[PDB]
Design a protein around this nucleic acid. Structure first.
Ligand SMILES: [Mg+2]
Ligand SMILES: [Mg+2]
Ligand SMILES: [Mg+2]
Ligand SMILES: [Mg+2]
Ligand SMILES: [Mg+2]
Lengths: 133, 58, 161, 350, 183, 49, 182, 137, 40, 48
RNA sequence: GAUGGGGUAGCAGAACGUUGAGUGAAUCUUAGAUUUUUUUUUUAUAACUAAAUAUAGAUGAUAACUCAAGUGAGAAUGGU
């Protein structure tokens, strides 16, 4: 695979050494700034998953700490970090009614919408050691 | 990683871990064929009153 | 606005300028010291053990002082023999030889005079009653403002302020 | 009657037993769900998971109850939580090292862990209730678990006459969490503050037993993983367990002990002076180094808050987020052990 | 959500900013060359900048509903810079709903009764959202005719150097270099 | 009235009112725990069935 | 623990808009205070409110046993030299309760009953309109001073529980964005 | 002197370290006489056996309930319940509803407001005007 | 109400009022308001 | 096999055996209406 | 990795609800049928869970399918 930059190989230990770290994962192209332990509530029902399934996220746009920040041009290389989540199940919203109406017309058309949402749980977010790479 | 799911038209699918690699789907008309722990399997586990972990393991 | 989506756009705030300078055809680690207060878990290099390898030059180096507010000076002007006089005068006439009088006579802090001596109980109870009679003169509007001052000080030391 | 046959076939001499029989555990759907909910290894039969729910208040015999199972489990929890706290925060004062232990393996968190497992309590202990329910008697407070702590001779005078109790002595006499040792029926009543403690005490003994049942059947490493998954995985901000008294005096003593130059408070930034809600940002400097920082509405409050943050930074020093544990050596051959940082102690100031 | 979790005490505090209506402003001036030709910020260009501070829009936590604005002390409002003949040809109007009671006054005639501070309050007042926070925000604009004001102690500082002072930038860069000596 | 009088004894307990010492009910004119001659003697003419 | 008497007065010959003002006048006062205000009121119904308020008190003492601790409570004040209780009603009025059993008008409202009658109004142009003669009732809830001493302590505890005023509050930023702005 | 506060306990994060399915019980009420329970009887004979085998951490209780529509009442760890009436539903429609209770939680439905919910502080502290390079008006 | 002739029920409740207030009789909770089996 | 009634649930929880004693202690009809008889005040008046 | 998605006059299709009727000499109900409320859940003009209040063994209620209409009202200076 493409070798990691020398500048990133010399500053990553300082990034992984600081107390806290955050990441901006990308699910289907949309970003989500999360940290280990956060509960992500996706705005869609992920098909083909059940509560207790482990997902390996591999599209990270930005991984950084307080002072430093690692940025990949399209995305950060997968070999540098390891972010995993667990499906916490599905959640729904209260049924909302939209009334489409025009003035001086009695017909009121109703639209009933009740969407489901997949809830994740970031249970791992660590930076790998690239001393070998 | 996936958990044990029941496919309506294919049967019970055992848990699989892709990191260590196996989608095996067992179907039948008896609980034992599905591959899950039944009441019979829970009674033999209770009668094995002789099993004991190693001394060093404790 | 009319919809929750239109509101989000009107209330938008762009990310920091440092994040906009995204690399091109490569990954890099940029140095972005935030304009925020650091937590207590960022131990300073002066508190790190000598064995801790994490000690390292400033991250900036890898790529006078402000005004004085409180600088006290400890003084020891009371000799061992003078401490006995402070204990005899206080117990002899606590009304005349108050801690303020003894503090100025021996050039000490009012707290120190109380460290080596304590007025008799009959005089201490008289001091508490004095402050208890002054508290009854406060109205509902002042008695509640003085109670908050005592609650804000406790909350401050509990980490809640 | 003839129209309503019994749903659960039971002998006539069943409502008189203290707790359901062992074989009753093999026909309850709650145990089979609770056993699989926790992913317990199949080496733990349903008869054992049923014994971890029978509190000593429901059964008086040394067997059939949860007395001895909870003790062996309490030792593992108290041990794995202690060594992990000293490796993560080796400078924590002894007073806060107890609140942190009680905040993880105390009756309060364990009660939440028991409820997070879907464990429903029984109304009254009896042989008719299904073994899948936590059964205890909150009306009887005579239940107690053997503790390694000893009774203080001055206990009588301690609570009455407000005598002093040193922190250094709590390590030998007091309990594991620093507390002092030994500190017909009519149901026409309401809940009491004592029954609330008895119910909370029953839940704690259950979670501890499950760690004991895993220890006897699955071994040591299996119990450590269980404690490391449910108890250690919880979150706690130790910075909020601090309550300082005269912090400026303690910070001056800290620098004096480590030979650092006297701390000096400097006004980094200020605004709104002579207002209702000003902001004074002061920083305590030990010569040229900046120890702590604080921003309050009063000049004194800003200096005090700066001292606390300078102390918290000293006590909250952590070698790493996931530090090695001395128990990692008694397992299968691993890398050699490296000496851990041992703090000299907390600062005792005026 | 973690971004917001923390101590927001200092993010909502009221900062006391300061600006002089006579000091040349390379950013708010239309003349940018030569150095000696740079003018101060015009009335409307200064009010547009102040209105942004009174709204707290310069903060990354701005919300139109929360009154997270700041204070602004403007001095030397007597030497308010204006272009053309605005000072003598601009007119301010008034009406109390009684026909015939149309009050008119020019800028210079309005600067003789209430000084240049009143001309700047009308400019900032029109640039603020017309709602229930308009009077609270406009009250945080303390404009004075000369260099004197009662807030010389309130102005935000950084190491004893008031912002806008000759050597205020050096005092800021010295405090950040000391904050980097920590994990 | 007995539906409302029984719920008060259960709740009030030691403060249950002395209804026997109360006034008459103007809706019918009867004292507490007392019938009316028309109902105690059953003098009300009934149908033939 | 607390005694209470709900008394519904008889059918008074007046309207709701007329009697509503005589019920708000006795609200919160003691039975003795209200009886003195109805005796010197120029309203014709003030005489009917005084008689009904005396009957309500006669039932409060016999049926409910209210206001039967004056002799015992009076002793603790003069015999032991005790300090009376100082409370503050919901409206802010300061009281000095020396007898916790003193009966007072806790709640009061007025309802409208049946129609007294109908009078015909013969106007011009041969028009006729019915004039309804009203008939309203009043319901007073009497309680002892033990209820006010409790409702006051609850108000005080609710204020000391709202914490003190902090200069720099930690107000939340209620807007999430998947990036850092600082 | 530093005194410890004894009123703060740890909080649990389900999913970090160990995952516990919230649904702990599922009641399946049918009727032998009601016509609306014809499909529920088919779900209990063909789809419940295997669906109950794949979810060993859920207690299933099949009991009759004549003169009443069929319902799927699930009990969760938080203490709340969710009952779904499946009258006039085919067996495969019962399974799609049973999976809704299995995946769901006791929490009430809420409108989508914010994706991420966090309890730990910001890695980069909240913005402060006194910890930056200053601002010149 | 002020003109209604006082009946024997109101003449009896006024004599009891003078007995309780004076202190002759001591008030006690009712025992015939309802016939319950609990008796508490 | 049959409908689970509020009595069955109490038996599983263990409360039922306690309810029998109290209801029996107060002479109350455990699982029944008793032997008191129906309301016969309006019936004696000829109510249809 | 199917295609399609505004709508008046107007045309067409598919359903719910209300009243009564058949299966019905059926089913269920003090181990609570029924209770104009409140609450809870489900793609929801509807039904459902629970709670509170009262107490019915049938002149009570009732699924499912079908039959027949005095079957659905913010609008007529509408009527009571
Ligand atoms: Mg005429
Ligand atoms: Mg379209
Ligand atoms: Mg009801
Ligand atoms: Mg008809
Ligand atoms: Mg109409």
């Amino acid at each position: 695979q493409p070798p990691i930059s020398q500048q990133v190989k010399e500053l990553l230990p300082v990034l992984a050494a600081q107390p806290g770290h955050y990441t901006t994962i990308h699910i289907h192209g949309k970003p989500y700034l999360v940290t280990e332990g956060d509960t992500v509530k996706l705005p869609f029902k992920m098909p083909g998953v059940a509560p207790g399934d482990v997902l390996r996220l591999n599209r990270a746009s930005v991984i950084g700490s307080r002072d430093l920040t690692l940025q990949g041009a399209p995305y950060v290389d997968e070999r540098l970090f390891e972010c995993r989540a667990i499906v916490m199940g599905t959640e729904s919203e209260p049924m909302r009614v939209m009334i489409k109406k025009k003035r001086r017309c009695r017909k009121k058309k109703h639209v009933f919408s009740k969407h489901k949402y997949t809830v994740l749980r970031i249970n791992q977010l660590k930076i790998n050691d690239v001393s070998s790479l | 990683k996936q958990v044990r799911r029941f496919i309506p038209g294919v049967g019970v699918q055992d848990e699989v871990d892709f990191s260590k690699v196996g989608a095996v789907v067992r179907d039948g008309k008896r609980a034992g064929d599905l591959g899950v722990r039944t009441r019979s399997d829970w009674e033999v586990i209770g009668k094995m009153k002789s099993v004991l972990p190693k001394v060093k393991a404790l | 606005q009319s919809t929750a989506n239109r509101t989000k756009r009107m209330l938008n705030i762009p990310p920091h300028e440092s994040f906009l300078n995204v690399p091109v055809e490569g990954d890099r680690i940029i140095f972005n010291p935030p304009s925020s207060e650091a937590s207590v878990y960022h131990t300073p290099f002066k508190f790190l053990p000598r064995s801790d390898p994490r000690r390292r030059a400033n991250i900036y180096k890898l790529f006078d002082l402000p005004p004085v507010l409180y600088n006290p000076t400890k003084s020891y002007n009371v000799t061992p023999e003078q401490v006995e006089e402070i204990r005899e005068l206080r117990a002899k006439d606590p009304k005349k030889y108050s801690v303020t009088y003894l503090s100025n006579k021996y050039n000490c802090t009012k707290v120190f005079i109380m460290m080596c001596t304590q007025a008799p109980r009959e005089h201490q109870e008289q001091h508490k009653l004095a402050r208890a009679r002054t508290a009854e003169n406060w109205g509902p509007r002042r008695a509640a403002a003085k109670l908050d001052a005592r609650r804000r000080k406790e909350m401050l030391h509990r980490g809640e302020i | 009657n003839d129209r309503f046959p019994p749903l659960e076939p039971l002998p006539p001499a069943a409502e008189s037993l203290p707790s359901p029989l062992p074989e009753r555990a093999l026909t309850s759907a709650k145990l089979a769900a609770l056993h699989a909910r926790l992913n317990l290894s199949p080496k733990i039969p349903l008869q054992t998971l049923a014994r971890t729910l029978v509190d000593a208040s429901a059964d008086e015999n040394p067997q059939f109850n949860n007395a001895n199972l909870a003790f062996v489990g309490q030792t593992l929890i108290n041990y794995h939580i202690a060594e992990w706290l000293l490796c993560k925060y080796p400078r924590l004062p002894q007073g806060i090292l107890f609140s942190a232990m009680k905040a993880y393996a105390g009756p309060k968190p364990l009660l939440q862990i028991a409820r997070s497992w879907g464990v429903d309590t029984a109304a009254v202990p009896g042989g008719e209730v299904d073994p899948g329910l936590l059964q205890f008697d909150a009306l009887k407070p005579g239940v107690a678990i053997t503790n390694f702590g000893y009774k203080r001779t001055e206990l009588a005078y301690l609570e009455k006459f407000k005598w002093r109790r040193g922190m250094a002595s709590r390590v030998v006499l007091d309990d594991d969490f620093g507390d002092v040792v030994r500190s017909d029926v009519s149901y026409d009543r309401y809940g009491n503050p004592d029954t609330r403690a008895a119910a909370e005490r029953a839940h704690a003994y259950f979670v501890r037993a499950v760690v004991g049942a895993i220890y006897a059947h699955c071994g040591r490493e299996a119990a450590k993983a269980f404690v490391k998954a449910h108890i250690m995985s919880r979150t706690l901000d130790i910075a909020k367990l601090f309550e300082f008294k005269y912090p400026t005096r303690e910070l001056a003593a800290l620098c004096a002990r480590e030979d650092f130059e006297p701390p000096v408070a400097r006004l980094l930034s200020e605004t709104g002076r002579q207002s209702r809600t000003p902001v004074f940002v002061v920083g305590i400097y030990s010569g040229s180094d900046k120890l702590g920082e604080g921003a309050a509405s009063s000049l004194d409050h800003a200096r005090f808050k700066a001292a606390m943050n300078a102390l918290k930074a000293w006590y909250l020093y952590s070698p790493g987020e996931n530090p090695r544990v001395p128990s990692d050596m008694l397992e299968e051959g691993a890398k050699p052990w490296t000496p851990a940082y041992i703090d000299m102690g907390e600062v005792i100031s005026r | 959500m973690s971004q917001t979790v923390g101590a927001t005490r200092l993010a909502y505090s009221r900062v006391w900013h300061h600006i002089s209506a006579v000091t040349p402003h390379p950013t708010l001036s239309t003349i940018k060359a030569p150095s000696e030709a740079i003018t101060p910020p015009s009335l409307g260009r200064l009010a547009s900048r102040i209105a942004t501070i009174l709204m707290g829009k310069h903060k990354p936590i701005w919300d139109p509903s929360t009154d997270c604005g700041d204070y602004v002390v403007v001095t030397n409002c007597a030497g308010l810079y204006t272009t053309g003949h605005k000072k003598w040809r601009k007119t301010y109007y008034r009406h109390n709903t009684r026909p015939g009671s149309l009050q008119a006054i020019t800028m210079d005639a309005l600067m003789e009764k209430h000084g240049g501070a009143e001309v700047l309050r009308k400019a900032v007042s029109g640039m603020l959202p017309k709602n229930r926070l308009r009077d609270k925000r406009l009250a945080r604009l303390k404009a004075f005719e000369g260099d004197a004001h009662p807030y010389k102690e309130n102005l935000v500082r950084f190491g004893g150097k008031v912002v806008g002072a000759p050597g205020w930038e050096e005092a800021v860069k010295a405090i950040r270099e000391a904050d980097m000596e920590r994990l | 009235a007995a539906v409302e009088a029984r719920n008060e004894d259960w709740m009030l307990g030691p403060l249950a009112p002395r209804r026997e010492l109360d006034e008459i009910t103007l809706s019918n004119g009867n004292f507490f725990g007392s019938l009316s001659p028309t109902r105690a003697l059953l003098e009300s003419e009934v149908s033939e069935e | 623990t607390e005694r209470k008497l709900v008394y519904k007065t008889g059918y008074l010959p007046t309207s709701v808009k007329k009697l509503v003002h005589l019920s708000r006048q006795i609200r919160g006062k003691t039975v003795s205070e209200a009886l003195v205000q109805m005796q010197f009121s120029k309203k014709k119904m003030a005489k009917e409110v005084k008689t009904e308020l005396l009957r309500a008190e006669a039932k409060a003492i016999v049926t409910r046993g209210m206001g039967l601790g004056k002799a015992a409570a009076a002793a603790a004040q003069k015999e032991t030299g005790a300090e009376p209780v100082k409370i503050q009603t919901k409206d802010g009025k300061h009281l000095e309760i020396r007898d916790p059993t003193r009966i007072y008008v806790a709640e009061t409202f007025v309802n409208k009953g049946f129609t007294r009658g109908v009078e015909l109004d013969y106007r011009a142009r041969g028009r006729v309109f019915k004039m309804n003669k009203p008939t309203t009732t009043m319901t007073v809830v009497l309680k002892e001073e033990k209820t006010r001493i409790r409702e006051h302590q609850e108000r005080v505890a609710k204020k000391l529980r709202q914490g003190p005023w902090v200069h720099l509050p930690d107000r939340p930023v209620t807007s999430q964005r998947q990036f850092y702005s600082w | 002197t530093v005194k410890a506060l004894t009123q703060i306990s740890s909080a649990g994060r389900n999913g970090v370290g160990a995952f516990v399915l919230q649904c702990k019980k599922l009641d399946i009420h049918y009727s032998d006489w009601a016509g609306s329970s014809r499909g529920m009887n088919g779900f209990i004979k063909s789809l419940l056996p295997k669906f109950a085998a794949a979810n060993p951490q859920i207690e299933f209780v099949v009991s009759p309930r004549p003169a009443k529509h069929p319902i799927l009442m699930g009990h969760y760890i938080n203490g709340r319940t969710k009952a779904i009436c499946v009258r006039n539903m085919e067996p495969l429609e019962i399974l799609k509803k049973a999976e809704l209770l299995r995946d769901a939680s006791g929490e009430k439905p809420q409108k989508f407001k914010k994706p991420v919910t966090s309890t730990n502080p910001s890695v980069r502290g909240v913005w402060s005007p006194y910890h930056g390079q200053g601002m010149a008006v | 109400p002020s003109q209604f002739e006082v009946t024997k029920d109101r003449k009896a409740i006024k004599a009891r009022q003078s007995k309780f207030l004076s202190g002759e009789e001591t008030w006690a909770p009712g025992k015939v308001n309802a016939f319950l089996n609990s008796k508490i | 096999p049959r409908r689970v009634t509020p009595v069955d649930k109490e038996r599983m929880v263990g409360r039922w055996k306690v309810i029998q004693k109290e209801l029996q202690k107060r002479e109350l009809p455990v699982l029944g209406t008793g032997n008191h008889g129906k309301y016969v005040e309006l019936k004696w008046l000829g109510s249809k």
